Every structure is written in structure tokens, then in C-alpha cells.
């Protein structure tokens, strides 16, 4: 038993983390096959980031202006191109540790593991979720740009995130591995703010099902509610509107534990209107929304992926 | 910026995770050089665990009764021995992925990363702390035995934990890599209970310093307190007695932020006597005690270890 925030084994990703140097700037890159992917603002200095013409700045750069280091080994750059907000440095040697991988644009609410890196060296890994406002609440200091988010299914590494910037509000924004920013953020140093960050309701119900499996049952009420009435309460407390697809996704969690989805929605409705009354659930005094229904089934059933 | 629960990159440990089979039982083992370390209750069935004579059960076993699998490769066992609560299976081939490692018996309050495994396959990694009652609050299902805890400094893998059992209370107990159980627990299926689990006070103050660095300052009071008076309040709310060594360890956190340790102890005293009043600190409504003062300096300064 037990339930904690888990990340995928980051071994397959460490073998792809490189250091990219371009002028006075250095950040991390992702080395898959003979292409190194890195944020495109490595070609900017601190003064260019106010309003950089990336196409113009990229013209002044040649292949030999990109210093890619894989540990102690240096990869000779033989081609550079940019799509959206990412660079593609074609290198001469392919990564011998390239795992089976995909580039996946995840949807909001879904989670992934983040391998934080500095100077191409992995520094730690933590679990994060794609907030409804397309931000993530990771932890990134200077030099962490280029760190990737990913999910590990079977043996395939599903890359989904690349960190790009810290917003003035303290949260983080980035792109998929094709360079497309999640949300309406751009890779500039301007007044950027994220919208209303609501709560992923389907994740909260999955986290509540994991509580029942683990022994916490004080919240299981003696009431019920319909999907329409529950969504009325959800909008008052800034929760994502629950759809029937969410109810269908919570099917196995409902079948494993015996509490119907709408029955758990009433328990969540009671928690939104009465609070926790000083109690805790899975060691937390708040309602957690960064566990997808798959994340719970992973941990409450023991799925491996080596 | 940002602050989250972080684990060390588990890559160096995945290359050491093997599967050990002995009869109908299968759990995980740690393969360093030409020795595989695994829990000693792999030689027991479900009925032996009430009161197993491990020396007697180990006599009935020979080298060829131990089936060690490293992925698809099988390691031929050429020698078996047990020290305390761990087995040592001498194998013919040394692990080509053995990192620089140590066997370290950590002290309570210190943290480590746990790589959960099933059938020798890594399944996920989460950060945990050695509670004052020598338990850990991980997450372990059947087949997770043999999973290790570790810390990564520089390039050296400091192994410190090996999971052994789920207590009836739902928490977990284990040994160091020399087989010595943390705490008064034994590797049997008997009525075992952990003592009073108190709060690691020095960790809470470090987590409060990380809050100040990250922008949370609502708890920084206009009072102060002495070490004696604070320890009086700490014992009322079941907190570890703060020593001068703890104050000395919080030195750099005090110097980086400007709030003295005793000044922060008054803010913590106010939080113990008044609660959070509905507010949160670093996204938590409770007081976190699973961040060592080193864990904060790791994350608030960007220390890498590849």
C-alpha cells in the first residue's frame, strides 16, 4: 500500500541530456538519434530577450557557433534549423543511448515527469501536471532551460515538454518537442500572465479513489448527486466541468472500489462546501489534482516499464 | 524559482536492479560488482513468515536454487551468504553498469530517493524521509521487496535503504544495505508497531526558509524566542527537540535569507499555536518535514550530479 508522488525512472532520459552553448548562453538539449533539440532562445543574450527577431539572430549563426557537449564528448554540428520555438542541431554522431521515443503533445490535466538539468547534467526529477491554463508548477533556476518532461509507457519514452521560461508570476511555460508553446506564451521577456488556473476535477476524484484503496474513508458520504448539480458546485469553487468521458475514465477505479463516480462526486461536493474540518486525506490537508486516473491505477496496481 | 519534492536521477540505480527468484517467491535485488544483494525472506514462502528460522531454511538451499535475472540475462549463482537480514549471492559476472557506490546507514530525519521495482523492473521513484520512529512512508505493493533507497552526491551512489515489509499500520520498514533493520523491526509476520512518529523540526525550518526564498512571507512574524522556550512548544505538538547542531546546520539558509534561526523558530511557534488560518505555504496547508536543510540548498541553488 501507500500513495506518493511518483515519477518515471529517468534513466532513459539522462542518456539524452546534453549541454548546448551559443555565445555567452548555455542551456540543456535533448539528443535523440543525430539531432539535438534545444530551446531557440540560446541564440539570444540577456538584452535580446525583450524583442528578439529569431530569424535574424539565427542568420548571424553558423554550425560552428553551436557548442554541444555530451558529458565530456563534443558533438560536431553539421546543420541547424528552427521550427516554431525549438532548434534542431544536426550532429555527426547519433546517440548510442537513444531510447524508443515519440513526440507527444499532451492535453491539459495530464501529468509527466520532469528531469531538471543544468549545464547538460541531470539534477533531479519531480512529477508535474499540465495545468488548465497551460502552465506547469515545476521548479526551475537559471540554466534549467532545455529540461524535458516525459512519460514512460512499456519501453517507449513519450517526450511532451521542454521548459522555456519563468513567468513573472513564478510559474513556468514551455513547448512540446516540436517547438509549439503550450498556451498563449511566447519566448520573449514581456508582460505575460496565465489565465485562471482551475482545478482538474477528474484528477481529484481519482486521488479520492486512491484514498479509499489506501484506507481513508472519512469523506465517503451518505448522499449522491447528478452530473448537472455537481458541475454547478464545481464552477462556484473554480473546478473543471466534469464530462461523461471523465466518468468513463474513472470506470475501473469505480469498479475496483465499489463507489460509483456520481457517489464520489457528492463526497467531493461535500468537501468543497465544508472543507476538510481539520482532517487529512493521504497526508494532505488540501485536495490534490495532479494525479491522473492512470497515475492512480499505476500506483494501486504496480505497473512496471523497464 | 519553484519548490517541489525532488528525487535523484535514478539512472545509475536502474542498471543495478535485478530479479531474484527462490522457489515460489520473487523480489528485487541490487547487483553491484559480482554480488547481488536482496532481502533474506526470499527463501521463505507465505507460511514460513510467521516464525522463520532463516539459518535452517538457508541450509536447504544451494547456489542453483537462486534464479537471478538481469533483464533477460541470468546470473549464475556461485555462492550464497547472509549477514543480518540480507542475502549476498556471489555471481560469476560483474555488473558492467556498477556505479561508484557506498553503503551508508542514514540517521533519522535524513531523506533519500526510493526506486520502486517489481520483478526486477523499475516502476517509479519518489522522495522519502527516515521518520524518527525509523519507519518510512513510501508506497509498496507485493513484489516491491528489494527496492532500494539512495542519495546521489557528485557521482557516488550512497545506498541507504532496502524495503522489507509493510507493517499492519500501513507504513514500511527495512534495513540498510548491510542487512541491519532501521528500528526495532524484524523480518517476520508478527504484531509489530512503530513508536510515536514525531515531526523533524529542523526539516520544517528548512522548508520554511525555502518558502521565504520562493516568495511566501506571510508567516514571518514580529516576535522571537529562545531555544529553551521553543523546545517547550515543540514537545507539546510532538516535535523533535531542536539542538544547537540543527541551528548550525540552518546557518547558510539563515545567511542567504537574513532571518535568524531563532527568529524563524518563533514563526514556527506561531504556526503550531495558531495553525495556518486557511493559508498555504509552498502549495501545502500542513507543515512539511521531509525536506532536509541540504534538500533546500540543493533546490534553491541548483546543484547537479551527473
Coordinates of C-alpha atoms in Angstrom, one line a residue:
Chain A
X1 CA 0.0 0.0 0.0
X2 CA 0.9 3.7 0.3
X3 CA 0.5 6.6 -2.1
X4 CA 3.1 9.2 -3.0
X5 CA 4.0 11.5 -5.9
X6 CA 5.9 9.2 -8.4
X7 CA 8.0 10.0 -11.4
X8 CA 9.1 7.6 -14.1
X9 CA 12.6 6.2 -13.9
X10 CA 14.7 9.0 -15.5
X11 CA 17.5 6.7 -16.7
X12 CA 16.4 6.6 -20.4
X13 CA 16.3 10.4 -20.4
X14 CA 19.7 11.1 -18.7
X15 CA 21.4 9.4 -21.6
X16 CA 19.9 12.1 -23.9
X17 CA 20.7 15.2 -21.8
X18 CA 23.4 17.4 -23.4
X19 CA 24.8 20.9 -22.9
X20 CA 24.3 23.5 -25.7
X21 CA 26.5 26.6 -25.8
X22 CA 25.9 29.5 -28.1
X23 CA 27.8 32.6 -27.2
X24 CA 27.5 33.6 -23.6
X25 CA 24.4 31.5 -23.2
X26 CA 24.3 27.8 -22.1
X27 CA 21.3 25.6 -21.6
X28 CA 20.3 21.9 -22.0
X29 CA 19.5 19.9 -25.1
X30 CA 17.8 16.6 -26.0
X31 CA 20.0 14.3 -28.1
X32 CA 17.9 11.8 -30.0
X33 CA 19.5 9.9 -32.9
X34 CA 21.7 12.5 -34.8
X35 CA 19.6 15.6 -33.9
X36 CA 19.9 17.7 -30.7
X37 CA 16.8 19.6 -29.7
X38 CA 17.1 22.7 -27.5
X39 CA 15.2 26.0 -26.8
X40 CA 15.7 28.6 -29.5
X41 CA 16.5 31.5 -27.2
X42 CA 20.0 30.0 -26.7
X43 CA 21.0 32.3 -29.7
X44 CA 19.9 35.3 -27.6
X45 CA 21.8 37.2 -24.9
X46 CA 20.1 38.9 -21.9
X47 CA 19.4 42.1 -23.9
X48 CA 17.9 40.3 -27.0
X49 CA 15.1 38.7 -24.9
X50 CA 13.0 41.9 -24.8
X51 CA 12.0 41.6 -28.5
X52 CA 14.2 39.1 -30.4
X53 CA 14.0 38.6 -34.2
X54 CA 14.9 34.9 -34.0
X55 CA 15.2 34.5 -37.8
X56 CA 17.5 37.5 -38.0
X57 CA 19.6 36.3 -35.0
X58 CA 19.8 32.8 -36.4
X59 CA 21.2 34.1 -39.7
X60 CA 24.3 35.5 -37.9
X61 CA 25.0 32.0 -36.5
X62 CA 26.7 29.1 -38.4
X63 CA 27.1 25.5 -37.5
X64 CA 30.4 26.0 -35.7
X65 CA 28.9 28.6 -33.4
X66 CA 26.9 25.9 -31.6
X67 CA 29.0 24.1 -28.9
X68 CA 27.2 20.8 -27.9
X69 CA 28.7 18.8 -25.1
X70 CA 27.6 15.3 -24.2
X71 CA 29.4 14.9 -20.9
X72 CA 33.0 15.3 -21.9
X73 CA 32.3 14.5 -25.6
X74 CA 31.6 17.3 -28.0
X75 CA 29.1 16.8 -30.9
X76 CA 30.2 18.5 -34.2
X77 CA 27.2 20.5 -35.5
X78 CA 26.7 20.0 -39.3
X79 CA 23.3 21.6 -39.6
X80 CA 20.9 24.0 -37.8
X81 CA 17.2 24.7 -38.3
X82 CA 14.4 26.1 -36.2
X83 CA 10.7 25.1 -36.2
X84 CA 8.5 27.2 -34.0
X85 CA 10.3 27.8 -30.7
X86 CA 12.9 25.0 -30.9
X87 CA 16.2 24.5 -32.6
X88 CA 17.4 21.3 -34.4
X89 CA 21.2 20.9 -34.4
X90 CA 22.1 18.1 -36.8
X91 CA 25.2 16.4 -35.4
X92 CA 27.6 13.9 -37.0
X93 CA 27.3 11.1 -34.4
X94 CA 24.0 9.5 -33.3
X95 CA 23.3 9.0 -29.7
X96 CA 24.1 5.3 -28.8
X97 CA 21.6 5.6 -25.9
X98 CA 18.6 6.8 -27.9
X99 CA 15.5 5.0 -26.5
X100 CA 12.4 4.3 -28.4
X101 CA 10.7 7.6 -28.2
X102 CA 7.8 9.7 -29.5
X103 CA 7.0 13.4 -29.6
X104 CA 3.5 13.8 -27.9
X105 CA 1.5 17.0 -27.3
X106 CA -0.2 16.2 -24.1
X107 CA -3.6 17.7 -23.1
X108 CA -4.2 19.8 -20.0
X109 CA -4.7 17.8 -16.8
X110 CA -2.3 15.1 -17.9
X111 CA 0.9 14.6 -15.9
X112 CA 4.5 13.9 -16.8
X113 CA 7.9 13.6 -15.1
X114 CA 10.4 16.5 -15.4
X115 CA 14.1 15.9 -15.4
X116 CA 15.7 19.2 -14.2
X117 CA 19.1 19.8 -15.7
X118 CA 21.8 22.4 -15.5
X119 CA 24.8 22.5 -18.0
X120 CA 23.5 19.3 -19.5
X121 CA 23.7 17.4 -16.2
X122 CA 20.6 15.9 -14.6
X123 CA 19.9 17.5 -11.2
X124 CA 16.6 15.8 -10.1
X125 CA 13.2 14.7 -11.2
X126 CA 9.7 15.6 -10.0
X127 CA 6.1 14.9 -11.1
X128 CA 4.1 17.8 -12.6
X129 CA 0.8 18.3 -14.3
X130 CA -0.2 20.5 -17.3
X131 CA -2.5 23.0 -15.6
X132 CA -5.7 24.0 -17.4
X133 CA -4.1 27.4 -18.1
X134 CA -1.3 25.6 -19.9
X135 CA 1.3 26.4 -17.2
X136 CA 3.3 24.0 -15.1
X137 CA 4.3 24.5 -11.5
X138 CA 7.8 22.9 -11.6
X139 CA 11.0 24.3 -10.1
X140 CA 13.5 25.9 -12.4
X141 CA 16.5 28.1 -11.8
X142 CA 18.8 29.8 -14.3
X143 CA 20.3 27.2 -16.7
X144 CA 17.4 24.8 -16.4
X145 CA 16.1 25.7 -19.9
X146 CA 16.0 22.7 -22.1
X147 CA 14.9 20.3 -19.4
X148 CA 12.2 17.9 -20.8
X149 CA 9.0 16.3 -19.5
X150 CA 8.1 12.8 -20.4
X151 CA 6.0 9.7 -19.7
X152 CA 7.3 6.1 -19.9
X153 CA 4.9 3.5 -21.2
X154 CA 6.2 0.0 -21.8
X155 CA 9.7 0.9 -23.1
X156 CA 8.8 4.0 -25.2
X157 CA 9.8 7.4 -24.0
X158 CA 6.9 9.8 -24.7
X159 CA 8.5 13.3 -24.7
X160 CA 6.0 16.0 -24.1
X161 CA 7.6 19.1 -22.5
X162 CA 10.6 21.4 -22.8
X163 CA 11.0 24.2 -20.3
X164 CA 11.5 27.7 -21.8
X165 CA 10.8 30.5 -19.2
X166 CA 9.8 31.5 -15.8
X167 CA 6.8 33.8 -15.8
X168 CA 6.9 36.9 -13.6
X169 CA 4.2 35.2 -11.5
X170 CA 6.6 32.4 -10.6
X171 CA 5.1 29.6 -12.7
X172 CA 6.7 28.0 -15.8
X173 CA 5.8 27.8 -19.5
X174 CA 7.2 25.7 -22.3
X175 CA 6.7 24.0 -25.6
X176 CA 6.2 20.5 -26.9
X177 CA 9.2 18.8 -28.6
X178 CA 8.1 20.4 -31.9
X179 CA 8.6 23.9 -30.6
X180 CA 4.9 24.8 -30.1
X181 CA 4.3 26.6 -26.8
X182 CA 1.7 25.2 -24.5
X183 CA -0.8 28.0 -24.2
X184 CA -0.5 31.6 -25.4
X185 CA 3.0 32.2 -24.2
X186 CA 5.9 33.4 -26.4
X187 CA 9.6 33.1 -25.9
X188 CA 10.2 36.8 -25.0
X189 CA 10.7 38.8 -21.9
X190 CA 7.4 40.7 -21.9
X191 CA 4.4 41.1 -19.6
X192 CA 2.9 37.6 -19.8
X193 CA 0.3 36.3 -17.4
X194 CA -1.5 33.0 -17.2
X195 CA -5.3 32.8 -17.1
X196 CA -7.5 31.5 -14.3
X197 CA -5.9 28.2 -13.1
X198 CA -8.8 25.9 -12.2
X199 CA -8.7 22.5 -10.6
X200 CA -8.6 19.3 -12.7
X201 CA -11.8 17.7 -11.3
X202 CA -11.3 14.3 -12.8
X203 CA -7.8 14.1 -11.2
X204 CA -9.3 15.0 -7.8
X205 CA -11.8 12.1 -8.0
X206 CA -9.0 9.7 -9.0
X207 CA -7.0 10.9 -6.0
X208 CA -10.0 10.3 -3.8
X209 CA -10.4 6.8 -5.2
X210 CA -6.7 6.2 -4.3
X211 CA -7.6 7.4 -0.8
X212 CA -10.3 4.7 -0.4
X213 CA -7.9 2.0 -1.6
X214 CA -5.3 3.1 0.9
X215 CA -7.8 3.2 3.9
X216 CA -9.0 6.8 4.0
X217 CA -12.8 6.7 4.1
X218 CA -13.9 9.5 6.3
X219 CA -15.1 11.6 3.2
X220 CA -17.3 8.9 1.8
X221 CA -20.7 10.5 2.5
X222 CA -24.3 9.1 2.7
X223 CA -25.5 11.3 -0.3
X224 CA -25.4 11.4 -4.0
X225 CA -25.6 13.9 -6.8
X226 CA -26.3 14.2 -10.6
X227 CA -23.7 15.4 -13.1
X228 CA -25.6 18.6 -13.7
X229 CA -25.9 19.6 -10.0
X230 CA -22.2 18.7 -9.3
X231 CA -21.0 20.8 -12.2
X232 CA -22.9 23.7 -10.6
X233 CA -20.9 23.3 -7.4
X234 CA -17.7 22.8 -9.4
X235 CA -17.9 26.2 -11.1
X236 CA -18.5 28.0 -7.8
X237 CA -15.2 26.7 -6.5
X238 CA -13.3 27.1 -9.8
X239 CA -13.3 23.4 -10.8
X240 CA -13.1 22.0 -14.3
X241 CA -16.5 20.9 -15.7
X242 CA -16.8 17.1 -15.4
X243 CA -17.8 15.4 -18.6
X244 CA -19.1 11.9 -19.3
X245 CA -15.7 11.0 -20.7
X246 CA -14.2 11.7 -17.2
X247 CA -16.9 9.5 -15.7
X248 CA -16.0 6.7 -18.2
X249 CA -12.2 7.1 -17.5
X250 CA -13.0 6.7 -13.7
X251 CA -14.7 3.4 -14.6
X252 CA -12.1 0.9 -13.4
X253 CA -11.5 3.0 -10.2
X254 CA -15.2 2.8 -9.6
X255 CA -15.3 -0.9 -10.2
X256 CA -12.2 -1.7 -8.1
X257 CA -13.6 0.1 -5.1
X258 CA -17.4 -0.1 -5.4
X259 CA -18.2 3.6 -5.1
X260 CA -19.9 5.0 -8.2
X261 CA -18.5 8.1 -9.8
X262 CA -21.5 10.2 -9.1
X263 CA -21.4 8.9 -5.5
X264 CA -17.9 10.1 -5.2
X265 CA -18.9 13.4 -6.8
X266 CA -21.2 14.0 -3.8
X267 CA -18.3 13.3 -1.4
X268 CA -16.2 15.9 -3.4
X269 CA -19.2 18.3 -3.3
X270 CA -19.3 17.9 0.4
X271 CA -15.6 18.6 0.7
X272 CA -15.9 21.8 -1.5
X273 CA -18.7 23.1 0.7
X274 CA -17.5 22.0 4.2
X275 CA -13.7 21.8 3.8
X276 CA -11.6 19.1 5.5
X277 CA -12.7 20.1 9.0
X278 CA -9.1 19.7 10.1
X279 CA -8.7 16.1 8.8
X280 CA -6.3 15.0 6.1
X281 CA -6.5 12.7 3.0
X282 CA -3.4 10.7 2.0
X283 CA -1.3 13.0 4.2
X284 CA -2.6 16.2 2.6
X285 CA -4.9 18.9 4.0
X286 CA -5.9 20.1 0.5
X287 CA -7.5 18.4 -2.5
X288 CA -4.8 17.1 -4.9
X289 CA -5.4 17.5 -8.6
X290 CA -2.1 16.3 -10.0
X291 CA -2.8 12.6 -10.1
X292 CA -4.5 11.4 -13.4
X293 CA -6.8 8.4 -13.2
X294 CA -3.9 6.5 -14.9
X295 CA -1.5 7.7 -12.2
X296 CA -3.6 6.1 -9.6
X297 CA -4.0 2.8 -11.5
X298 CA -0.2 2.8 -12.0
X299 CA 0.4 3.0 -8.2
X300 CA -2.6 1.0 -6.9
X301 CA -1.8 -2.0 -9.2
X302 CA 2.0 -2.0 -9.7
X303 CA 2.7 -1.4 -13.4
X304 CA 6.4 -1.6 -14.4
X305 CA 8.1 -0.3 -17.5
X306 CA 11.8 -1.2 -17.9
Chain B
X1 CA 12.3 29.5 -8.7
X2 CA 9.7 26.9 -7.6
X3 CA 9.9 24.2 -5.0
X4 CA 8.8 20.6 -5.3
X5 CA 9.6 17.1 -4.0
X6 CA 12.6 16.0 -5.9
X7 CA 14.4 12.7 -6.3
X8 CA 17.9 12.0 -7.6
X9 CA 18.2 10.8 -11.2
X10 CA 17.5 7.0 -10.8
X11 CA 19.5 6.0 -13.9
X12 CA 22.6 4.8 -12.1
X13 CA 20.4 2.6 -9.9
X14 CA 18.2 1.1 -12.7
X15 CA 21.3 -0.6 -14.1
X16 CA 21.6 -2.5 -10.8
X17 CA 18.0 -3.6 -10.3
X18 CA 17.7 -7.4 -10.9
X19 CA 15.0 -10.0 -10.2
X20 CA 15.7 -12.8 -7.6
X21 CA 13.7 -16.0 -7.7
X22 CA 13.8 -18.6 -4.9
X23 CA 11.0 -21.1 -5.0
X24 CA 7.6 -19.6 -5.4
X25 CA 8.9 -16.2 -4.2
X26 CA 10.3 -13.4 -6.4
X27 CA 11.6 -10.0 -5.3
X28 CA 14.2 -7.4 -6.4
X29 CA 17.9 -7.5 -5.9
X30 CA 20.8 -5.0 -6.1
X31 CA 23.6 -6.0 -8.4
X32 CA 26.9 -4.3 -7.5
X33 CA 30.1 -5.7 -8.9
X34 CA 29.8 -9.6 -8.7
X35 CA 27.4 -9.6 -5.7
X36 CA 23.6 -9.4 -5.7
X37 CA 22.0 -8.1 -2.5
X38 CA 18.4 -9.0 -1.8
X39 CA 16.1 -9.4 1.2
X40 CA 16.6 -12.6 3.1
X41 CA 12.9 -13.6 3.3
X42 CA 13.0 -14.6 -0.4
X43 CA 13.9 -18.1 0.9
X44 CA 10.5 -18.2 2.7
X45 CA 7.1 -19.0 1.5
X46 CA 3.9 -17.3 2.8
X47 CA 3.6 -19.8 5.7
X48 CA 7.2 -19.5 6.8
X49 CA 6.9 -15.8 7.6
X50 CA 5.2 -16.3 10.9
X51 CA 8.4 -17.5 12.6
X52 CA 11.1 -18.4 10.1
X53 CA 14.4 -20.0 11.2
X54 CA 16.4 -18.3 8.4
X55 CA 19.6 -20.2 9.1
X56 CA 17.7 -23.5 8.9
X57 CA 15.8 -22.5 5.7
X58 CA 19.0 -21.3 4.1
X59 CA 20.6 -24.7 4.7
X60 CA 18.1 -26.4 2.5
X61 CA 19.1 -24.0 -0.4
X62 CA 22.0 -24.4 -2.7
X63 CA 23.5 -22.0 -5.2
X64 CA 21.4 -23.3 -8.1
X65 CA 18.2 -22.7 -6.1
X66 CA 18.6 -18.9 -6.7
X67 CA 17.4 -17.6 -10.0
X68 CA 18.8 -14.1 -10.6
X69 CA 17.6 -12.4 -13.8
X70 CA 19.1 -9.1 -15.0
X71 CA 16.6 -8.2 -17.7
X72 CA 16.8 -11.2 -20.0
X73 CA 20.2 -12.3 -18.8
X74 CA 20.5 -14.8 -16.0
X75 CA 23.4 -14.6 -13.4
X76 CA 24.8 -17.9 -12.4
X77 CA 25.0 -18.0 -8.6
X78 CA 28.3 -19.4 -7.3
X79 CA 28.0 -18.5 -3.6
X80 CA 25.4 -17.5 -1.0
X81 CA 25.7 -16.0 2.4
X82 CA 23.5 -13.9 4.8
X83 CA 24.5 -11.1 7.1
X84 CA 21.8 -9.9 9.4
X85 CA 18.6 -9.6 7.3
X86 CA 20.2 -9.5 3.8
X87 CA 21.4 -12.2 1.3
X88 CA 24.6 -11.9 -0.7
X89 CA 24.5 -14.0 -3.9
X90 CA 28.0 -14.2 -5.4
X91 CA 27.6 -14.3 -9.2
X92 CA 30.0 -15.2 -11.9
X93 CA 29.8 -11.9 -14.0
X94 CA 30.2 -8.4 -12.6
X95 CA 27.7 -5.7 -13.4
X96 CA 29.2 -3.6 -16.2
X97 CA 27.0 -0.7 -15.1
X98 CA 28.1 -0.7 -11.4
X99 CA 28.5 3.0 -10.4
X100 CA 30.8 4.3 -7.7
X101 CA 28.8 3.5 -4.6
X102 CA 28.9 3.3 -0.8
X103 CA 26.7 1.6 1.9
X104 CA 25.6 4.3 4.3
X105 CA 23.4 3.9 7.4
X106 CA 21.5 7.2 7.4
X107 CA 20.3 8.9 10.6
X108 CA 16.6 9.7 11.2
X109 CA 15.3 12.9 9.6
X110 CA 17.5 12.5 6.5
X111 CA 15.9 11.9 3.1
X112 CA 16.6 9.6 0.2
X113 CA 15.1 8.6 -3.2
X114 CA 13.3 5.3 -3.5
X115 CA 13.3 3.4 -6.8
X116 CA 10.2 1.1 -6.5
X117 CA 10.6 -2.1 -8.5
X118 CA 8.6 -5.2 -9.3
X119 CA 10.1 -8.4 -10.8
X120 CA 13.5 -6.5 -11.1
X121 CA 11.9 -3.8 -13.3
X122 CA 12.0 -0.2 -12.1
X123 CA 8.4 1.2 -11.7
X124 CA 8.9 4.7 -10.3
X125 CA 10.8 6.9 -7.9
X126 CA 9.7 9.1 -5.0
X127 CA 11.4 11.1 -2.3
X128 CA 11.0 9.8 1.3
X129 CA 12.4 10.5 4.8
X130 CA 13.6 8.3 7.6
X131 CA 11.0 9.1 10.2
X132 CA 12.1 9.5 13.9
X133 CA 10.4 6.1 14.7
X134 CA 12.7 4.5 12.0
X135 CA 9.8 3.9 9.6
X136 CA 9.3 5.3 6.1
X137 CA 6.1 6.4 4.4
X138 CA 6.7 5.1 0.9
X139 CA 4.4 3.1 -1.4
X140 CA 5.0 -0.6 -1.8
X141 CA 2.8 -3.4 -3.2
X142 CA 3.5 -7.1 -3.4
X143 CA 6.8 -7.8 -5.2
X144 CA 8.3 -4.4 -4.3
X145 CA 10.7 -6.0 -1.7
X146 CA 14.3 -5.4 -2.6
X147 CA 13.7 -1.8 -3.8
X148 CA 16.5 0.4 -2.6
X149 CA 16.8 4.0 -1.3
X150 CA 19.8 6.1 -2.2
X151 CA 21.3 9.6 -2.4
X152 CA 23.4 10.8 -5.3
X153 CA 26.4 13.1 -4.4
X154 CA 28.8 14.1 -7.1
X155 CA 28.9 10.8 -9.0
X156 CA 28.8 8.4 -6.0
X157 CA 25.6 6.4 -5.3
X158 CA 25.1 6.3 -1.5
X159 CA 22.8 3.3 -0.9
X160 CA 21.0 3.5 2.4
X161 CA 17.7 1.6 2.3
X162 CA 16.2 -1.7 1.2
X163 CA 12.5 -2.3 1.7
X164 CA 11.5 -5.4 3.6
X165 CA 7.9 -5.3 4.8
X166 CA 4.6 -3.5 5.1
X167 CA 3.6 -3.0 8.7
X168 CA 0.0 -3.7 9.7
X169 CA -0.4 0.1 10.3
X170 CA 0.3 0.7 6.6
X171 CA 3.9 2.1 6.9
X172 CA 7.1 0.5 5.7
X173 CA 10.3 -0.8 7.4
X174 CA 13.6 -2.0 6.0
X175 CA 17.3 -2.4 6.5
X176 CA 20.5 -0.7 5.4
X177 CA 22.5 -2.5 2.7
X178 CA 24.3 -4.5 5.4
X179 CA 21.0 -6.1 6.5
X180 CA 20.5 -4.2 9.7
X181 CA 16.9 -3.1 10.2
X182 CA 16.2 0.5 10.8
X183 CA 14.5 0.5 14.2
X184 CA 13.3 -2.4 16.3
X185 CA 11.6 -4.3 13.4
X186 CA 12.3 -7.9 12.5
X187 CA 11.7 -9.7 9.2
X188 CA 8.7 -11.7 10.4
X189 CA 4.9 -11.6 10.2
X190 CA 4.1 -10.7 13.8
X191 CA 2.4 -7.9 15.7
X192 CA 4.9 -5.0 15.0
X193 CA 4.1 -1.4 15.7
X194 CA 6.1 1.8 15.3
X195 CA 6.5 4.2 18.2
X196 CA 5.3 7.8 18.3
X197 CA 6.2 9.4 14.9
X198 CA 7.2 13.0 15.7
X199 CA 8.0 15.8 13.4
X200 CA 11.5 16.5 12.2
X201 CA 11.7 20.1 13.4
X202 CA 15.0 21.0 11.7
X203 CA 13.4 20.0 8.4
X204 CA 10.4 22.1 8.9
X205 CA 12.5 25.2 9.5
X206 CA 14.5 24.4 6.3
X207 CA 11.2 24.1 4.4
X208 CA 10.1 27.4 5.9
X209 CA 13.4 29.0 4.6
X210 CA 12.7 27.7 1.2
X211 CA 9.3 29.3 1.4
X212 CA 10.9 32.7 2.1
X213 CA 13.2 32.3 -0.9
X214 CA 10.2 31.4 -3.1
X215 CA 8.1 34.4 -2.1
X216 CA 6.0 33.1 0.8
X217 CA 6.4 35.5 3.7
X218 CA 3.1 35.7 5.5
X219 CA 4.4 33.5 8.4
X220 CA 7.4 35.7 9.1
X221 CA 6.2 37.2 12.5
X222 CA 7.3 40.2 14.5
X223 CA 8.4 38.1 17.5
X224 CA 11.3 36.0 18.6
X225 CA 12.0 33.1 21.0
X226 CA 14.9 31.3 22.8
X227 CA 15.9 27.8 22.2
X228 CA 14.6 26.6 25.5
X229 CA 11.1 28.2 25.2
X230 CA 10.8 26.9 21.6
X231 CA 11.6 23.4 22.6
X232 CA 8.8 23.7 25.3
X233 CA 6.3 24.4 22.5
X234 CA 7.8 21.7 20.3
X235 CA 7.2 19.0 22.8
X236 CA 3.5 20.0 23.2
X237 CA 2.9 19.5 19.5
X238 CA 5.1 16.3 19.2
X239 CA 8.1 17.9 17.5
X240 CA 11.7 16.8 17.7
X241 CA 13.8 18.8 20.2
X242 CA 15.9 21.3 18.3
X243 CA 19.6 21.2 19.1
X244 CA 22.4 23.7 18.5
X245 CA 23.7 21.5 15.7
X246 CA 20.3 22.0 14.0
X247 CA 20.8 25.7 14.4
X248 CA 24.3 25.4 13.0
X249 CA 23.1 23.4 10.0
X250 CA 20.5 26.1 9.2
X251 CA 23.3 28.6 9.1
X252 CA 23.6 29.1 5.3
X253 CA 19.8 29.2 5.0
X254 CA 19.8 31.9 7.7
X255 CA 22.6 33.8 5.9
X256 CA 21.0 33.6 2.4
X257 CA 17.7 35.0 3.6
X258 CA 18.5 37.2 6.6
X259 CA 16.1 35.7 9.1
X260 CA 17.9 34.2 12.1
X261 CA 17.2 30.6 13.1
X262 CA 15.6 31.7 16.5
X263 CA 13.6 34.3 14.6
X264 CA 12.2 31.5 12.4
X265 CA 11.6 29.3 15.4
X266 CA 9.1 32.0 16.7
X267 CA 7.3 31.9 13.3
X268 CA 7.1 28.1 13.6
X269 CA 5.9 28.5 17.2
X270 CA 3.2 30.8 16.0
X271 CA 2.2 28.3 13.3
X272 CA 2.0 25.5 15.9
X273 CA -0.2 27.5 18.2
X274 CA -2.4 29.3 15.6
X275 CA -2.4 27.0 12.6
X276 CA -2.3 28.2 9.0
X277 CA -5.6 30.2 9.3
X278 CA -6.6 28.8 5.9
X279 CA -3.5 30.0 4.1
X280 CA -0.9 27.8 2.4
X281 CA 2.9 27.6 2.3
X282 CA 4.6 26.3 -0.9
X283 CA 1.2 24.9 -2.0
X284 CA 0.7 22.9 1.2
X285 CA -1.8 23.5 4.1
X286 CA 0.3 21.5 6.5
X287 CA 3.9 21.8 7.8
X288 CA 6.3 19.7 5.7
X289 CA 9.1 17.9 7.5
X290 CA 10.6 15.7 4.6
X291 CA 13.0 18.4 3.3
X292 CA 16.4 18.3 4.9
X293 CA 18.4 21.6 5.1
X294 CA 20.5 20.1 2.3
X295 CA 17.5 19.3 0.2
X296 CA 16.6 23.0 0.3
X297 CA 20.1 24.1 -0.6
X298 CA 20.1 21.6 -3.5
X299 CA 16.9 23.1 -4.9
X300 CA 17.4 26.8 -4.1
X301 CA 20.9 26.8 -5.6
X302 CA 20.9 24.3 -8.5
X303 CA 23.4 21.5 -7.6
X304 CA 23.9 18.9 -10.3
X305 CA 25.4 15.4 -10.0
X306 CA 25.8 13.6 -13.3

